[PDB]
Symmetry: C5
Subunit: 333 residues, 5 copies
């Protein structure tokens, strides 16, 4: 045996009973798997690396070069106890064997690597949906050892994070990867040090335009064609107005199926409900025209063209909706 494993008790950390042992971390992100709006979490796959020194693993050599071991020797030596804070579920790949790397230098320096998949929560805001921008983070912390026994820091500062060029999401644009560090306090155990990985996401608006914004606009313009039809065709204009109202209600209902039950109004809800009001006022407009015409006929009868409401509605209704779009798209850009 090259290493004298059997001659030491590895239940105690290096420098037991003394100062803390420094540990460095490197991370390479492989891919982001999925994002859920209803559950408000994301899935990430990454490579995690650790650096430390242990004099008990020293062996004699003349080349002074790192040597690689099969990786099942890990379960017999001391290893850090990092865990992902605020995670929902995670696992380590084990095909065809445990994805574990162990390299030991002659002086005792140790390199340890893993391949894990982690699901973590992210508090998203949907006030500006679907034109919103979201920021999420991943947290790494040691579970058992406090800052007085283990010091956790990035190995090379800002250069310790790498990303694969194949990272891509169909619905989101990924940007601004950076790392930060902060302390954490638990009231009954002590102080701990945390590491952060931050990134930003931006949606794509093309799908929502074709699916929601364009059908809504067309249904509104369908109601405007009733102002150019003769008012004597009562069974022709009434069904046109009513059916557009019901179809607009169907479009409104279908949008909410894919989103969580938030307690505030979203940007898309404003567009849909104002459009519903425009179609609803179209139905009331003809009822006023029909009622006034009948009253006039009876008044003229008791003595023994285009109605002004229709003439003005052809101009006011298109003008108001255009003004609404100008204001709406100026606020949400």
């Amino acid at each position: 045996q090259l290493l004298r494993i059997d001659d030491h008790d590895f239940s105690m950390r290096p420098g037991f009973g003394g100062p803390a042992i420094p540990v460095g971390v490197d991370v390479q992100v492989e891919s982001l798997d999925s994002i859920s709006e209803v559950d408000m979490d994301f899935t990430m796959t990454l490579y995690l690396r650790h650096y430390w020194k242990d004099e008990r693993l020293s062996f004699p050599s003349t080349n002074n070069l790192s040597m690689t071991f099969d990786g099942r020797l890990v379960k017999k030596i001391w290893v850090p106890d990092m865990f992902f804070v605020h995670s929902k579920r995670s696992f380590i790949h084990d095909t065809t064997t445990d994805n574990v790397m162990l390299r030991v230098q002659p002086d005792g320096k140790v390199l340890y690597s893993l391949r894990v998949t982690v699901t973590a929560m992210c508090n998203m805001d949907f006030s500006r949906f679907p034109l919103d921008t979201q920021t999420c983070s991943l947290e790494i912390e040691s579970y058992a050892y406090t800052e007085d026994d283990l010091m956790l820091y990035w190995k090379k500062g800002n250069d310790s994070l790498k990303t694969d060029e194949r990272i891509s999401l169909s619905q989101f644009l990924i940007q601004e990867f950076h790392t930060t560090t902060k302390l954490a306090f638990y009231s009954s155990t002590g102080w701990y040090n945390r590491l952060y990985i931050n990134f930003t996401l931006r949606r794509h608006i093309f799908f929502f335009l074709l699916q929601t914004y364009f059908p809504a606009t067309l249904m509104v313009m369908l109601s405007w064609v009733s102002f150019w039809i003769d008012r004597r065709a009562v069974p022709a204009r009434v069904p046109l107005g009513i059916t557009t109202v019901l179809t607009m209600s169907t479009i409104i209902t279908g949008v909410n199926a894919s989103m969580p039950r938030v307690s505030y109004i979203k940007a898309v809800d404003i567009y849909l409900w104002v459009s519903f009001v425009f179609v609803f006022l179209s139905v009331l407009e003809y009822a006023a025209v029909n009622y006034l015409t009948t009253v006039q006929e009876r008044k003229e009868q008791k003595l023994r063209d285009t109605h002004a409401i229709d003439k003005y509605s052809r101009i006011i209704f298109p003008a108001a909706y255009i003004l609404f779009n100008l204001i709406y798209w100026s606020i949400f850009s």
Copy 2:
């Protein structure tokens, strides 16, 4: 080896054959994950801590300070056997290692911690849905040892429960965290002691207003516009009344898709079905008007304006529906 583990048989609890061993518990809640109405359960993630004393783990030292071990020594010493009563499923996180903490003082005091996710059942009541308030609880009990062998109590009374400030639910408001204690009896094993964690939830009404209450009101008001149309347009008023009835039926059906098949009427069902009656009576109203007009024409013919029903319906129908809303919102607030 610092601890004389091999010199003792840890298959027997401390004080075996004598009085009970006291055990203290501390809990910190991390987050609540999800709530299911159809399955009537909730998911919680928390940190669980235990306190006890064991003289067999004593070691000599001069500093009199707690020492931390890697946590894989737990499987070789005596550990309590707590379990969650009335739980459906649960697990312990194990990445990158088992989330276990073990700290032993020189005199033998032991601190043990875990990170678990538990799903537990809750009997909810939906009589006042969606304006309901629900209360749920989590129960902790020892499986194997009765009160004559193990005493279970909160470590610091009311101060033993802590909550993270990031706990949030999109649909519910969380309040009133407190802890209680009660005994339990099993007819064939004996008496046990239980610990409780209680909290309260309140829904948000904004989503249900826009989705159910507002579309229902608009469809009712669509039926009222038929009272202002000339009664000679038979193919104009009949389709208007019929189509609103069918659309109201569609709205009623869609609501029940998201709820369990309870055997009592809910608050939302009352609003929807009374609205359906209002629209249904609108269809019968014109049929009476049409029939009476035809009878009058034949009666006048055999001898060789606005009908009174329409005139009164314009006032009675809006007044009745307003009175219903006043009573309905006064009862359910």
Copy 3:
């Protein structure tokens, strides 16, 4: 060590090579989780207890009282091999440790307990759905040992089964818990003894009334209003009849989504399809009225009020449907 475990080979049952060893069973039901109509199975959580005697586990004492062990000693002694027959999936809870209890008396009597969740199949009949009553059972049997080596019986007869007062199902009513016993034969291994747990379930009819029976009745009564409208309004009565037919077809389709593809007619199908016939005959009725009127006009023209069909339909159609309901609800109660 209190027990002389190392001095015996526990690969052989007590009384090896001789008469059978009696084993007693006690069960306490905790809850029933879910019932699936499409898969025809149910989920149950329960506590399972075993009783037997083994002289190899005797230890000296003066108090003659049961002693409790941590439960990880189970994997080193002989334990019965019970399994659930006709089960689909099952598991044993293991948080924070294996839910196992082991108690040994000085003379060698052993008490063993477990907490398990079991899914088992049940052959349900839906001929009278949704007014049906279903009976299901759970079976317990030893896998390896026949009746010549192990005798299985209830510990206290009818008193061996206990149920939690919190057992409840939202859609079903649970009643009539009792236990029975019967032998089983396998053609290639021998005879075995089985234990049974039986219970009965009854549905709640409130949900199905509001969801299926009430909308169906209202759509039929909508078709009857066409008999009171003037027959000269052809474009008014034709759409009314046609649209009710299509809506009734939609209601029929939606019911079958939640049920398995059985090969026999159910009680709810009878109500829906007879209702469809009533609406369908309404459409044919006006076509006969319209055709006869046109023929009469041409006959009178070639020589140079209310039609009798409408008058009789106002009485016959409501009377027939009322008679159908009287017969239908008298058979299915």
Copy 4:
């Protein structure tokens, strides 16, 4: 210890370095769980038994009778290495212990049994859906040992397969269980012997008749009522024809939701699409009638009853559809 396990190295099969060792197999089927059309696989639960001889397990006795061991001794002796070919997933039940039986005779004969659940693929054909008949099979083969080291055969020929009388499927009829045997060749490892279990399935047509065939026929007959209505009611006959076309399209769409995206036409698709053509031609028929009537009026006007198309359509349309059904049901029976 009755068996001299420690005196032998069980890493080598019996008769190592010599002729092959015969192994017999018996199977008893317990139930079939589910069948998936989209994934094209089935789930089966069964008992698997093995027979062989090993002189290293002999023990002295005077009774010459089989003795049963607890089953955890299996992990210390040589056991065959059978696996299920073309399986997707499978597992062995382990509650409350591993479902393993081990019986050894004095001369060394060994009986070994297991309880497993296996999911296996089946290539189904849907050309005659839903009147199709499917055949599937389950394959058993040894993984490591070729025919020169292990011979695999059925223990008792045709009598080696047994089935439980409780096997039942709600949608399928199960028949014709039988077993066969065939050799298999792998280009880089050698020859192997396989065992087969075959069965046949037949669907139930009742559900599809009520759900698809009956609604389709009724919608076609609804279009025929327009031939008996006066041709002067243009706004009465046009909506009747159009609405039946759209409803027929809805019925066609709903059927394909439950089936995989095959690349050939099915039997049910033929019925639905021919029915759509019949309804579509009804709409074109009235357009021809309306156009010819207007032309005739203008021709007669410029000089200063029932149309023949309607008269013939009342006979030709019902006759053609009846002939189609006679041919359709004669081919597919």
Copy 5:
């Protein structure tokens, strides 16, 4: 024991501290399970084989033939550490035992085999959907050892890949299986060698023709029948045009339910939206005809047949749509 396993430490690879050890790979594909457009991944089942030499496993013999071991000896010897890059999830079958083969020759040559199921991501493009062609690949790489310690290559070059003749997909056509090799670099660990398996997929167009292209064409031709109806029937032509617009909108909405929310327009979207424009212009066409007729009547009145727009529309509208189809199918073939 035939092998001297206990006399060596298998935590170090063969040739430790020296040149790299060559490893050969063979693959046989069994089946492809499923393809997901929303998640952009595929599932594959395959057999993986490894070849290497280890002098520590040599044993004496006179026949010079491969010997097969039960496969549980794998966990005690050195085995490569291959893993699938860019995979989402995977597992190894373990019924009725681990699907592992181990064969060792007298000189130390080792053959190792596995049966695994792997899910891997594939970046698909839907610009030409549903007439698109997709290419995907599977990557194999060693996790722990770099090119200086382990050399990875195909055992027999182009002949190392085999496929089962039963591989089939209902919606796709599989072709062009081939293998390639390329190096990979990680910035913090070194150089690695990768192996690739490539294949191509082509969709079947039959389903999409009947489901989307044919219903869209028929609805357009329904709007053309309004040009042959007398223009004095205002309540007859207006509902015909309006209802076809709404039905076309429904067809457009239903298509997008099964596809991911991409940010570019697809081939099917072009056909659907141009068809919607054709139906929309039909509604505006009659409004122009109706308005001009009313103006002409008033102009002639104030002084005290077929309109030209309808005559030309009968020719221009069919001609334009035919030209569009010729261009559309010439580009996308």
